[PDB]
Design a protein around this motif. Structure first.
Motif, PDB file in Angstrom:
ATOM      1  N   UNK K   9     -22.048 -29.073 -25.669  1.00  0.00           N
ATOM      2  CA  UNK K   9     -22.634 -29.217 -26.991  1.00  0.00           C
ATOM      3  C   UNK K   9     -21.690 -29.079 -28.194  1.00  0.00           C
ATOM      4  N   UNK K  10     -21.828 -30.025 -29.117  1.00  0.00           N
ATOM      5  CA  UNK K  10     -21.164 -29.998 -30.433  1.00  0.00           C
ATOM      6  C   UNK K  10     -19.765 -30.600 -30.383  1.00  0.00           C
ATOM      7  N   UNK K  13     -18.808 -33.608 -32.237  1.00  0.00           N
ATOM      8  CA  UNK K  13     -18.610 -33.396 -33.659  1.00  0.00           C
ATOM      9  C   UNK K  13     -17.157 -33.099 -34.049  1.00  0.00           C
ATOM     10  N   UNK K  17     -17.382 -33.634 -39.112  1.00  0.00           N
ATOM     11  CA  UNK K  17     -16.745 -32.656 -39.982  1.00  0.00           C
ATOM     12  C   UNK K  17     -16.475 -31.423 -39.120  1.00  0.00           C
ATOM     13  N   UNK K  51     -24.641 -33.086 -25.403  1.00  0.00           N
ATOM     14  CA  UNK K  51     -25.316 -31.951 -26.020  1.00  0.00           C
ATOM     15  C   UNK K  51     -26.439 -31.431 -25.121  1.00  0.00           C
ATOM     16  N   UNK K  52     -26.664 -32.055 -23.977  1.00  0.00           N
ATOM     17  CA  UNK K  52     -27.804 -31.669 -23.165  1.00  0.00           C
ATOM     18  C   UNK K  52     -27.412 -30.977 -21.857  1.00  0.00           C
ATOM     19  N   UNK K  76     -20.987 -23.688 -26.608  1.00  0.00           N
ATOM     20  CA  UNK K  76     -21.881 -22.517 -26.653  1.00  0.00           C
ATOM     21  C   UNK K  76     -22.434 -22.052 -25.304  1.00  0.00           C
ATOM     22  N   UNK K  77     -22.557 -22.982 -24.374  1.00  0.00           N
ATOM     23  CA  UNK K  77     -23.074 -22.658 -23.075  1.00  0.00           C
ATOM     24  C   UNK K  77     -22.135 -21.704 -22.267  1.00  0.00           C
ATOM     25  N   UNK K 102      -9.050 -20.098 -29.969  1.00  0.00           N
ATOM     26  CA  UNK K 102      -8.865 -18.839 -29.267  1.00  0.00           C
ATOM     27  C   UNK K 102     -10.115 -17.971 -29.356  1.00  0.00           C
ATOM     28  N   UNK K 107     -15.876 -13.971 -32.930  1.00  0.00           N
ATOM     29  CA  UNK K 107     -16.949 -12.990 -32.671  1.00  0.00           C
ATOM     30  C   UNK K 107     -16.914 -12.350 -31.283  1.00  0.00           C
ATOM     31  N   UNK K 125      -7.216 -21.511 -26.721  1.00  0.00           N
ATOM     32  CA  UNK K 125      -6.521 -21.314 -27.974  1.00  0.00           C
ATOM     33  C   UNK K 125      -5.407 -22.298 -28.204  1.00  0.00           C
ATOM     34  N   UNK K 126      -5.110 -23.105 -27.189  1.00  0.00           N
ATOM     35  CA  UNK K 126      -4.008 -24.024 -27.276  1.00  0.00           C
ATOM     36  C   UNK K 126      -4.341 -25.382 -27.976  1.00  0.00           C
ATOM     37  N   UNK K 129      -4.217 -29.784 -26.785  1.00  0.00           N
ATOM     38  CA  UNK K 129      -3.279 -29.715 -25.638  1.00  0.00           C
ATOM     39  C   UNK K 129      -3.831 -29.031 -24.371  1.00  0.00           C
TER      40      UNK K 129
END
Ligand SMILES: CC(C)(C)NC(=O)C1=C[C@@](O)(C(=O)O)C[C@@H](O)[C@@H]1O
Ligand SMILES: CC(C)(C)NC(=O)C1=C[C@@](O)(C(=O)O)C[C@@H](O)[C@@H]1O
Ligand SMILES: CC(C)(C)NC(=O)C1=C[C@@](O)(C(=O)O)C[C@@H](O)[C@@H]1O
Ligand SMILES: CC(C)(C)NC(=O)C1=C[C@@](O)(C(=O)O)C[C@@H](O)[C@@H]1O
Ligand SMILES: CC(C)(C)NC(=O)C1=C[C@@](O)(C(=O)O)C[C@@H](O)[C@@H]1O
Ligand SMILES: CC(C)(C)NC(=O)C1=C[C@@](O)(C(=O)O)C[C@@H](O)[C@@H]1O
Ligand SMILES: CC(C)(C)NC(=O)C1=C[C@@](O)(C(=O)O)C[C@@H](O)[C@@H]1O
Ligand SMILES: CC(C)(C)NC(=O)C1=C[C@@](O)(C(=O)O)C[C@@H](O)[C@@H]1O
Ligand SMILES: CC(C)(C)NC(=O)C1=C[C@@](O)(C(=O)O)C[C@@H](O)[C@@H]1O
Ligand SMILES: CC(C)(C)NC(=O)C1=C[C@@](O)(C(=O)O)C[C@@H](O)[C@@H]1O
Ligand SMILES: CC(C)(C)NC(=O)C1=C[C@@](O)(C(=O)O)C[C@@H](O)[C@@H]1O
Lengths: 134, 135, 141, 141, 136, 136, 139, 134, 137, 137, 141, 135
Positions: K9-10, K13, K17, K51-52, K76-77, K102, K107, K125-126, K129
């Protein structure tokens, strides 16, 4: 009366402006003004710090101690400070309570006399002043 | 050059080490003049009263030395009023809050404080004043 | 023997509304009950109520200066105040924590008390009868 | 009429142990009867280190619908079985502790019984069994 | 209909050291009240006892309360208990978004016993709440 | 101004087992919008992906969102990140008072990145959110 | 084959005297025993309030290599001893609870038994024991 | 000198490879050579264990205790043992720290003189020998 | 007497290494066993949470019982719990494997507190036994 | 028949120090007792972690049992643990004070899950009993 | 060799933006960047975004049925889906978890992954790449 | 352009006691050169030796690749040393720190590392190298 100032891991990097050297000097100037003799040593080694601690116990001298990261992680250092018969003033340059949560715990505060935090380099000087009186 | 020393709930009871509150006010007042400072020392058990005083120190841009007593571990209200201060704030505990009950080891004040002096008895104040005299 | 019974925030609202809890005895009645029982036990009992933390502490300081015992129902403060605990820890005479409701049959936060560790003892969940029983304990010492 | 007073593990070692107050279980048993009797009540006072025995006693009190004054020793903090037995009491159940449990280890500040109990008396020592009696004396529900 | 708007600790200092001072909030509440055809009383204190007093009055007068409790929100069982007594609606109002600050501001002792809570729609939470009340 | 009102899982079931139903709700909201010189698009889905699709569009269009995510409120990081993109206000709405229910309903993944949150005000919550958007 | 049905603390107090949460312990033995008959197994149903007693019955099953349907009542949430006794069993062990433990006090949502049992039936009333029997008949 | 060895619930079912009787034999054989007298009993019953703990308190005799599951659950047992004036050594045959997380807390340890874990059966014998030396 | 056996993410994959029944074999074995008891078993599987919800909504409105094995969602979806909440007929949660003999995270169910009962670790059989229960109530 | 006795930070301050037996005194008993048992006892103390690891690496290479009183490092060092985890022969963790009768944080150790066993609260003699255990493999 | 790259998901995007950020290499430019570097190592990159969850799960199944490698950026999953974890756990061929940012610098909730324990490995975090380093790993084994 | 591969406690002991630390050094070197960098690889069991080396990377503004071993989970002094780097720092682990004991799932380093690679064996080192070639 000799006072032992023991700076821990990373504090040699101070100012990388107040460098560790400017700290050492600054401390000796208030030391000699207080009618005291300050012995300031730093090491990145826990072994070394433990040993300076041991000496100061045998010599019955107070310790001003900024342990850096070891403050939050090390029982061994705590256990070496616990044998001090003379006062032990723990010190931080920065306010440890304004940063990461794990810095808000200290293995040292419970066995220490008093704690000075976030008062900058003057923590040390204000610590000497206390140890002048007891 | 005024400095505000504020003592909260129960500090009115010191001496019943053996230093009474009346005595400590004098110590601080004298010690303060020696450094060219003017110490306004005050104590109340009333959380509202401490807020008015900390509010005034915000407006005047005067530095505060705060020993909040039990409010230290408890009043988010006090913290907020304090977070407003622009001059330094030095949190002070007489006793070593860290060698006592587990709950005294959280402060609400500490994160918004300039610095914190603990376990150095009454001298904690005089030290705070000294820091104020330099910076 | 002068015995101080001190009641905290909201306690002036007893029985009159919140009538589920509570129970139904108003604060004024409670004063009378407590005075009556004090008389049969042969003690004088000064009872006092306040929503003001500053006022409770000041009553406790006085209790500490007189070395008079204290029966305290601190209301919501039980679970929250450290200042008050700290005041109470000063008393030389005994300290009895009284809660009218059964603080353990309600919300999890009521199940903790700052006062309990520094009190002589605690009575919970026996209604207004808990003040009088606590009086009884003091009459014996 | 009839109250059951029940004492769980190690209350047989009252006294005595060690000592630390000095009153033995045998004397506490006589003190409670005396007191109940002075109040118009009859107090059957048993103690056992066997959880099963305690559940047998609680069952009976339930079947007879007699009130219960319980000091369950260590069992206060561990036994869900004890709790479910007491839960079915219909008559007042008043949990007792000689010592201030909130003044000790942390595992002591939780009770499985306090929530299903009428009320709780802690730390008024031996007298806490008598005060419990006085609560019952002043009601019948 | 009289709504009671009660502001707690530090709230007397709005605008001093949102955009809006406490005086302007009062001024705004007055107009919105007149738009709505209500009477509203706005009060601010840093005393918990003073706060309890005002809630009691509302409790006895069967009147609605709009409460911005300040820090007391997260810490006071006394105030939650005074409020739980209330029989007309109670709406908890926070000017800032509490869930986007420190983790401890995300717990409120009031939400559980309030009718509802409006968070971080700024000074407009007061007006929007008076509105909810005007429609009961 | 176009406003999106988005409603998550189960919100289709309002009033089928209070009273007010989804269709009716759409209509009150539509009614309030017009009255406020606003235009409202209300939609409902039980599909997280579909909700993400709607949130993506509102970020592209820079339109305001009124969001009632239902259960996803307390569970979806994915949803939270979609919403993080919004430039126009996000208002979180719950019909019921989520702080007087099960403990786990007291944590929202959305509240921290929302402009504000209105809880427990019933269906009127939506219309207080529209009115907030209607000012600035 | 034989199947051991074991009821722990407060379970002899089923039915009235604990209304709902509706049958007595005797009636439950009757039900359980007849259902085992039809299934072609013999059920040995015992209740005790003694943790000591449960362990021996439990040791006896590990000895006989018989299966066990256990309803431990409150010891479900407190007893390591009882769990370590069941850990021993070479035949199947089925924890049973009459009420839905997940709909009550938090402290009931944990079982020391669950991880070592074959399975767990919860909230299905007295049928739990029967469904468990049925399970065992089949294996 | 008398040493009480108390085996808790489930211990009557050992097999270490040795059975409980093989274990009494062994602690007795060893007890002899140190100049001690070991009474070794086992119950699945808490009541019995508390009773055996009271006796030992009254007679002020050391106790070696392997409480089994009760180690991790019983405040009652812990309070019985707190009574002892003579030493108490807590003893687990397996390494309780290399299994489930819950096994890693004990109600007894804070009140015992010391603990021996993981050394097998031979842990009873090491306890005996500590007591030889008092 | 219709019974809803609803299966969640991943149960399509019953196969297949191993503890050796396929999903299609499950459906059939459940459909024939329900008829032996004189019920109608309606066995449906989806990886899509929305599809799962739609089928809970219908069972709510039909007042038909539900046997649910919600797979991973058991441990994570309030949404599902809330759909399930509104059933009026019995809801039996079932897991094939013993969830308590595994990852700590698997030992919390969101559905359990609002279900009638749960059956866990009884293998494919847990289904059959929940039909038995359903025949009686 | 060699046995390593490694003592971590602070342990060379024994009997100095909470006045009763010194570190040298203790090296002595252990050898005395070790000889008495027909094994050879190499007894080292160091305050440096990196040094203790060296000794552990050496014992593993040598396949020689260890008896480790790690001092404070018991409660904090993962690197100590991984070193120790490599041994193919008995490791015995040892403490002098009863770690459970003090600060909560003394009550977890990183070693106990990989030690052969743990001896606590039994004074200097714990070293001896460890030794005795070891002289039966 | 086919390698399946899968974005949850996402991730559609990215770029704009995308924020992040604030760039920005666009999900389309990513697909291109990957099949290229895959060809260079002699691999076949089949890059997908959905997204599904059910869609993700199904791509996971086919990979399992095909013994093909998977590089997963589950968005998010990662932090929330046990269903997704269990699908991945059936993979015979390797699984690399990829996060662009990263996760440990944001959070606390982001610092837990339900996927990492059943993945061969994780790259974090890379940036973009991450994927190519992942294909690289796979090109060896 | 210099890359500093740093190895912590017990990592001297890869191999049997497949890749040994010796082999790992050669691999890193070949690969680095084949990419146009020079890789200075180093091992130590000594927290103080690694801090020293970190400080030097900070002073040179050279990138660091660090496998800190068990110190990943326990050393705040190490973390603070790395906070000081102005060039990238990639954290490495051979094994999967998430498929092991729970305590291994927290890194004091992750938060301050540009990046982190885990569970890709000895190759994780070379992929981190590759990462750095292209900044
Ligand atoms: C060189 C520097 C990174 C600033 N030193 C430190 O690590 C630290 C500073 C402190 O001792 C200090 O504030 O003096 C606090 C401590 O938490 C931290 O480890
Ligand atoms: C005068 C006295 C009653 C001791 N005041 C206090 O309660 C307190 C004082 C302190 O701030 C102090 O140490 O100065 C600590 C705080 O935890 C405590 O509640
Ligand atoms: C009159 C009333 C509001 C019920 N008083 C109280 O606030 C309270 C009563 C109590 O003291 C009580 O139960 O006696 C407990 C405390 O939790 C609570 O705040
Ligand atoms: C197990 C037993 C010896 C009964 N323990 C006690 O005596 C105890 C004393 C108490 O009951 C008591 O105050 O009577 C409290 C309880 O926590 C504790 O277990
Ligand atoms: C899962 C679902 C069925 C969507 N639940 C709801 O409807 C819900 C309603 C709410 O949004 C509501 O108050 O409108 C609150 C939320 O906690 C809950 O999940
Ligand atoms: C007879 C009754 C007292 C209702 N039984 C129980 O309390 C219990 C039995 C249970 O195992 C049961 O539901 O069968 C649950 C357990 O939590 C509880 O202690
Ligand atoms: C089933 C059996 C292994 C006999 N149970 C025990 O004896 C036990 C005793 C132990 O102290 C032991 O290892 O000696 C540990 C304890 O957790 C375990 O329950
Ligand atoms: C198909 C397979 C991957 C084996 N299923 C599962 O993962 C699961 C199914 C379960 O219902 C089960 O145990 O039957 C429970 C759940 O924890 C788990 O996600
Ligand atoms: C030598 C002295 C500092 C007194 N001992 C200890 O504090 C310690 C040593 C111990 O290993 C010990 O008891 O031998 C325990 C440990 O918790 C602690 O670090
Ligand atoms: C495209 C974008 C919105 C940045 N995706 C994400 O939200 C996320 C992707 C991530 O895997 C990522 O770092 O690429 C991390 C995850 O925590 C987060 O939800
Ligand atoms: C290979 C060995 C010598 C055992 N290294 C390690 O101990 C470790 C290596 C790791 O950094 C690693 O595998 O990369 C993980 C860390 O937790 C552990 O301390």
């Amino acid at each position: 009366l000799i006072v032992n100032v023991i700076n821990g891991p990373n504090l040699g990097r101070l100012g990388r402006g107040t460098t560790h050297d400017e700290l050492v000097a600054l401390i000796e100037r208030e030391a000699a003004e207080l009618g005291l003799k300050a012995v300031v040593r730093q090491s990145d080694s826990e072994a070394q710090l433990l040993d300076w601690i041991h000496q100061a116990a045998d010599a019955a001298e107070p310790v001003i101690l900024n342990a850096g990261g070891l403050t939050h992680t090390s029982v061994a250092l705590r256990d070496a400070c616990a044998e001090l018969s003379a006062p032990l003033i723990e010190v931080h340059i920065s306010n440890v309570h304004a940063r990461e949560e794990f810095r808000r715990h200290s293995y040292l505060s419970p066995i220490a006399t008093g704690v000075i935090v976030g008062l900058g380099i003057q923590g040390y000087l204000l610590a000497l002043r206390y140890l002048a009186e007891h």
